[PDB]
Amino acid sequence: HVLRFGGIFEYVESGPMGAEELAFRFAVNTINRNRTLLPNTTLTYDTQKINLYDSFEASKKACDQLSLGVAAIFGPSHSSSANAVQSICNALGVPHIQTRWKHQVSDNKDSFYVSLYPDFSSLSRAILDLVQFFKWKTVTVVYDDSTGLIRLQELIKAPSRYNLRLKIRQLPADTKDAKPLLKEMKRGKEFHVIFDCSHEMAAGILKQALAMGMMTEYYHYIFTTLDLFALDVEPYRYSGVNMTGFRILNTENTQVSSIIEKWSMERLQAPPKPDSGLLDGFMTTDAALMYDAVHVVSVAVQQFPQMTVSSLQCNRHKPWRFGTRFMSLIKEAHWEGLTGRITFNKTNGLRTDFDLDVISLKEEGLEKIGTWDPASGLNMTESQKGKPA
């Protein structure tokens, strides 16, 4: 059978194809080549090219996709466009899958959306567990985007629940102007910094901190982003910074490594950027989340064979016939993807359960030193080294 998926992707003019759309079509091609999953059903896509940070263009392309009719829509990354797409599809009952975190208003009453980004409440609680493991007292949190405080809404709100004192600083609008911020960082004599930004901004401020002479044994930077393996830690491994962080991308399994290798030669078409400081030829978290999103919606399809795509109209509010059943089938799947165990909160659409690997920087590079889970605490196997007879 032929099934159609809705793909909305904010395109860049000229250049290569975008990474998320490449992951989406790679996931479609690998599912179509496989016969163990979806044996008598084939998948088609309809990718769209919208502008960045626009919602009306996303509204028009979503209305055109519903005129064509799709099983589900894979939304964009900006918050306003994803909010408009989520409201449009929740008005029509078509399920929404989003791979990026967005701030959600508590008064919203939508129920046709799932988000496969890990929730920053659980991420910030993991960061608090990591801070309490390191016995810190004074923490400086440097945040990039003004929404990011909500992403640290649990971490900032720590009133006397732990002996901790916070100083919060914002990165400037320009990327290169971290030097006055790092000069006030150095003169303030604060040595435990939590960086909340993207991986490219993290590499940029790591270059700025190396130029500022912040790479000693006194600094123990913590990155909230999950793309630390995309960083090139070659000019920092002999320094003595500690650089603890998190990783959801389960590279321990051989099948995930095989999927990464099958991604790699389609990824190596784009040339590297030596000025960026990013290790080229690697999966970002967003591409792996899009791949796992396609796999979760595919295994949700496989339990529901009565799947007829019906064209819908934006001018009316006629709901889809197979809305609630397919939504409930989506909201209970348990698929082992590249990020490991995938499940959803039954009262939300948020992936509040996962399995993080706590990595850090040593003289060999980056290595896994601990394991964090929301149900348990934090294992931290270097503290499990004491096993007396």
Ligand X SMILES: *[C@@H]1O[C@H](CO)[C@@H](O[C@@H]2O[C@H](CO)[C@@H](O[C@H]3O[C@H](CO[C@H]4O[C@H](CO)[C@@H](O)[C@H](O)[C@@H]4O)[C@@H](O)[C@H](O[C@H]4O[C@H](CO)[C@@H](O)[C@H](O)[C@@H]4O)[C@@H]3O)[C@H](O)[C@H]2NC(C)=O)[C@H](O)[C@H]1NC(C)=O
Ligand Y SMILES: *[C@@H]1O[C@H](CO)[C@@H](O)[C@H](O)[C@H]1NC(C)=O
Q: Name the site residues for ligand X (rule: CB under 6 A).
A: 125, 129, 345, 347-348, 352-353, 374, 377
In whole angstroms, what is the distance from residue 85 CA to residue 57 CA?
Answer: 10
Question: Considering CB distances under 5 to 8 angstroms, the limit depending on partner class, which of its own copies, ligand X, ligand Y, none binds residue 272?
Answer: none
Instruction: Provide the minimum distance between the beta carbon of 377 and ligand X in the complex, in angstroms, as a whole number.
Output: 5
Closest C-alpha to 299, from 6, 22, 34, 19: 34
Query: DSSP secondary structure string, 32-98?
Result: HH-SSSSTT-EEEEEEEEE-TT-SHHHHHHHHHHHHH--S-EE--SSHHHHHHHHHHHHHHT--EEE
Question: Considering CB distances under 5 to 8 angstroms, the limit depending on partner class, which of ligand X, ligand Y, its own copies, none binds residue 220?
Answer: ligand Y
How far, in Å, are 176, 205, 274 from residue 211 at the CA level? 12, 9, 17
Closer by beta carbon to ligand X, 156 or else 210: 156
Strand partners, 336: 341
Closer by beta carbon to ligand Y, 92 or else 215: 215
Tally of residues, the chain: 389
From the list 199, 220, 267, 331, which residue makes contact with ligand Y (rule: CB under 6 A)?
220
In whole angstroms, what is the distance from residue 160 CA to residue 327 CA?
Answer: 41
Closest C-alpha to 354, from 368, 340, 364, 336: 340
Q: Check if the beta carbon of residue 224 is closer than 8 Å to that of residue 356.
A: no
Q: Check if the beta carbon of residue 209 is closer than 8 Å to that of residue 182.
A: yes
Question: Considering CB distances under 5 to 8 angstroms, the limit depending on partner class, which of ligand X, its own copies, ligand Y, none binds residue 59?
Answer: its own copies
Q: Check if the beta carbon of residue 80 is closer than 8 Å to that of residue 57.
A: no
Q: Is 242 a residue that touches ligand Y (CB under 6 A)?
A: yes
Instruction: Provide the minimum distance between the beta carbon of 385 and its own copies in the complex, in angstroms, as a whole number.
Output: 27
Instruction: Provide the minimum distance between the beta carbon of 379 and ligand Y in the complex, in angstroms, as a whole number.
Output: 4
Q: Burial of 325 by CB count in 10 Å (0-12 exposed, 13-18 middle, 19+ buried)?
A: exposed
| Per-residue contact flags (x/-) with ligand Y for residues 365 to 384, judged by CB under 6 A | -----------x--x-x--x
Instruction: Provide the minimum distance between the beta carbon of 13 and ligand X in the complex, in angstroms, as a whole number.
Output: 39
Closer by beta carbon to ligand Y, 39 or else 238: 238
Q: Which residues bind ligand Y (CB under 6 A)?
A: 217, 220, 242, 362, 376, 379, 381, 384
Q: Which residues bind its own copies (CB under 8 A)?
A: 52-57, 59, 78-80, 83-84, 87-88, 90-91, 103, 105-109, 140, 145-147, 149-150, 153, 156-157, 159-160, 165-170, 173, 179, 184, 188, 210-213, 215-217, 235, 238-241
